[PDB]
């Protein structure tokens, strides 16, 4: 899934231009500053130095795991509270 996968390049400030984050969804090999950064604020001859100062990473998240964990925790909490209400009111 697109939401599960992404890749970001963080560029610290370089000469006039300030720090900038470029986050796009791409495969691991497609995760590169030149592909992730389009266009480059710095000039062409300094684009390579900007890339060197730039640190890029490719990340994957199991959003479905968070889905299930949150859902089951909420269900358990709701059931426990419903049982507490049962004990406090209905049980008498």
């Amino acid at each position: 899934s697109s939401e599960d996968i992404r890749c970001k390049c963080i560029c610290p400030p370089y000469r006039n231009i300030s720090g900038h984050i470029y986050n796009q969804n791409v495969s691991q090999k497609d995760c590169n500053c030149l592909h992730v950064v389009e266009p480059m604020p710095v000039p062409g001859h300094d684009v390579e130095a900007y890339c060197l100062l730039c640190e890029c990473r490719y990340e994957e998240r199991s959003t479905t795991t968070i889905k299930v964990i949150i859902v089951i925790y909420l269900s358990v909490v709701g059931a426990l509270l419903l049982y507490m209400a049962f004990l406090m009111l209905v049980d008498p």
């Binding site: 998240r61 199991s62 968070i66 859902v71 426990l80």
Partner: protein, 707 residues
């Protein structure tokens, strides 16, 4: 034997020697029956693997529960700041996980996430929006705290607290029925998330040990070997605590070290590998679920220098100076809770403490941030890529005063709040608060050292160790050292703590500085008292816990601790023969003794053995039901084989432990600690003179400490 014989009452210690004999007898029976049939061989194989199976189950359950708790706590903690309408299941980071509207200035800024002000006010910025965010933060914290405390009170009272003190007492031999039950497990699992989200000065890492122990206790019922024997169950619980620490900090080696050092009174060699395996399994599960390999990974490019030991040692001292204080403060507060009426209103206390915490934390950024997140922020090394506020001054010159002042305010807030937060009737942990306090202190110290180095590079130490105009000083390392120092000062753990910190950081280059800081903190804390926070809580609760540190005076003798003494009447004894069932039942009802010494004759006073009161009554009732005519008139004969007398020799212990009156009490205490004896019969000239009980030793030690 009679059903129910050998069982232990609640709030009673187990006799480890008797449990070992029971385990040996069961092993003999199982091994003997192997040749009888193939099914017996399969049962024996299952018994042999019972330990491996139970540790595997405990590790799997601990990992799953830790991952679920971590994710739920993150989501619910971020619920206070706002909601993600596009996804009511993403926290702030997840909702900005892939947004393209994010900015270098703000990593967690996306249109998808929406703060409560923009939900209700519709404006993200403005005094009204800030007031609304403040109010909603307080309201959510209060609701989470109320829910947690209500669940703890309604269903599982034992779920409150870290549980490490009670785990210690149980592993010593103490019994608390329901502490490690399913109800407590579930309630604590929910309430840990609730409390962590409430924003109170507490953590979930320590309570994970109790959660794992509950899982292990529940799984022990599946395997008869560990369900029948209490010592085997306690070994499984030690492995469970190791796995719990592993999931808490991702430190299986550190988990095993902690299990040996702190909670486990007895650690058989086999339990070492079993605990390590359980911890590894739990950590593997956690890595499988929770990520979506180091939680607090740090990257200090410059290696730590020798002179930096002096600041670290200073941090160490601070740790101890804080630790002792907390131990003297929290306990006092806790004592007041047991003495005055404010302890009669647990829910109200939790609500008030949560309200105070939220109110004073929201204005300050560091306090508002989650404690684990604050620790991570403090640990990280400042760099050009980073945009953390703490490093802003470094960017500006290379405001420092503003960041330092905010850090000190957060430190004071956390230090004062941890005293009241710990001990309330919700699952609370001290590890995360101690880490945060120490990390803030270490960050302040490291910032000061870096400023001294940069401003004054003419100093020979700074110039020689660090190049002029170079960021040799890494404040993250100082924060880590301070966290370790504070945790060592409060807990007094030495090697397990160092290994846990190293695993949580993933860096073996800082193990020497961490060890030095922990040593200094422990020494400073011992200067003000050698008892840790968990041990102090054990003593405050009055549990029957005996520690190797405690010892008797040289003058003390076994005669002094003998139960009969002078004022007390002679201890009850049971005649070997010519004594009716009615007489035994009347003696059982009259006295609350754990067990009675059985003597051959009243005049002879020659010890034949020791018969437990529980075993005596259970055997009498079972014999009455089994055999007719036992109306209490029939005599009871404890000697080896119309009246049809009841035989109670089996329940009686043939070789009770015996010591002489002239024996020093230090030897008696040493024997009790090493062998886990429930009682020892003091005999003079080969005749019974009295009984010393672990309860008697604990009472004498408590009076000596109270004087």
């Amino acid at each position: 034997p009679i059903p129910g014989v050998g069982t232990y009452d609640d709030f009673h210690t187990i006799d480890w020697v008797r449990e070992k004999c029971k385990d040996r007898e069961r092993h003999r029976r199982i091994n003997s029956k192997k040749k009888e049939s193939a099914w017996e061989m399969t049962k024996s194989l299952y018994d042999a693997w019972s330990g491996w199976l139970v540790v595997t189950l405990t590790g799997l359950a601990s990992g799953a529960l830790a991952g679920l708790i971590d994710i739920a706590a993150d989501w619910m903690t971020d619920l206070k700041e706002g909601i993600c309408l596009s996804a009511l299941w993403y926290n702030h980071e997840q909702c900005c996980w892939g947004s393209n509207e994010t900015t270098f200035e703000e990593r967690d800024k996306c249109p998808q996430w929406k703060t409560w002000a923009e939900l209700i006010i519709g404006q993200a910025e403005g005094p009204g929006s800030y007031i609304m965010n403040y109010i909603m933060y307080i309201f959510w914290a209060l609701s989470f705290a109320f829910l947690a405390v209500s669940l703890v009170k309604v269903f599982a009272p034992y779920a409150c607290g870290s549980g490490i003190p009670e785990i210690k007492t149980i592993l010593s031999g103490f019994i608390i029925r329901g502490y490690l039950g399913k109800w407590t497990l579930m309630i604590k699992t929910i309430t840990l998330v609730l409390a962590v989200a409430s924003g109170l000065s507490l953590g979930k890492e320590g309570p994970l040990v109790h959660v794992a122990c509950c899982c292990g206790n529940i799984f022990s019922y599946l395997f008869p070997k560990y369900s029948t024997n209490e010592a085997k169950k306690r070994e499984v619980l030690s492995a469970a605590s190791a796995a719990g620490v592993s999931v808490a900090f991702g430190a299986p080696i550190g988990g095993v070290l902690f299990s040996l050092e702190e909670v486990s009174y007895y650690f058989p060699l086999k339990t070492l590998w079993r605990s390590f395996f359980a911890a590894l399994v739990a950590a593997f599960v956690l890595r499988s679920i929770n990520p979506f390999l180091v939680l607090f990974y740090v990257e200090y490019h410059t290696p730590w220098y020798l002179f930096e030991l002096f600041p670290f040692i200073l941090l160490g001292v601070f740790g101890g100076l804080w630790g002792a204080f907390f131990i003297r403060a929290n306990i006092a507060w806790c004592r007041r809770r047991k003495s005055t009426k404010f302890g009669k209103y647990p829910v109200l206390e939790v609500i008030i403490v949560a309200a105070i915490t939220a109110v004073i934390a929201f204005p300050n950024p560091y306090t508002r941030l989650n404690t684990s997140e604050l620790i991570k922020e403090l640990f990280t090394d400042c760099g050009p890529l980073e945009s953390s506020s703490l490093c802003d001054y470094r960017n500006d010159m290379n405001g420092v005063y503003s960041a330092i002042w905010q850090l000190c305010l957060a430190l004071i807030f956390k230090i004062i709040m941890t005293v009241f937060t710990f001990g309330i009737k919700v699952p609370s942990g001290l590890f995360i608060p101690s880490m945060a306090i120490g990390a803030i202190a270490g960050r302040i110290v490291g910032i000061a050292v870096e400023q001294l180095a940069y401003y004054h590079h003419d100093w020979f130490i700074f110039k020689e160790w660090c190049e002029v105009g170079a960021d040799c000083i890494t404040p993250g390392l100082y924060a880590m050292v301070g966290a370790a120092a504070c945790l060592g000062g409060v807990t007094r753990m030495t090697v397990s703590l160092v290994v846990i910190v190293f695993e949580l950081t993933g860096g073996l280059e800082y193990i020497v500085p961490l060890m030095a800081a922990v040593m200094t903190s422990k020494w400073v804390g011992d200067a003000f008292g050698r008892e840790g926070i968990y041990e102090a809580h054990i003593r405050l609760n009055g549990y029957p816990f005996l520690d190797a540190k405690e010892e008797f005076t040289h003058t003390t003798l076994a005669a002094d601790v003998m139960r009969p003494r002078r004022n007390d009447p002679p201890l009850a004894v049971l005649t070997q023969d010519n004594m009716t069932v009615d007489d035994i039942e009347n003696m059982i009802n009259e006295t609350s003794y754990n067990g009675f010494p059985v003597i051959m004759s009243k005049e002879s006073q020659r010890l034949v053995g020791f018969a437990l009161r529980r075993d005596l009554t259970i055997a009498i009732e079972s014999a009455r039901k089994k055999q007719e005519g036992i109306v209490g008139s029939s005599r009871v004969c404890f000697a080896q084989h119309s009246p049809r007398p009841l035989k109670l020799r089996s329940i009686l212990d043939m070789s009770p432990f015996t010591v002489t009156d002239h024996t020093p009490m230090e030897i008696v205490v040493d024997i009790f600690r090493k062998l886990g004896l429930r009682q020892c019969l003091v005999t003079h000239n080969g005749r019974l003179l009295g009984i010393i009980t672990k309860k008697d030793i604990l009472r004498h030690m408590a009076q000596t400490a109270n004087q």
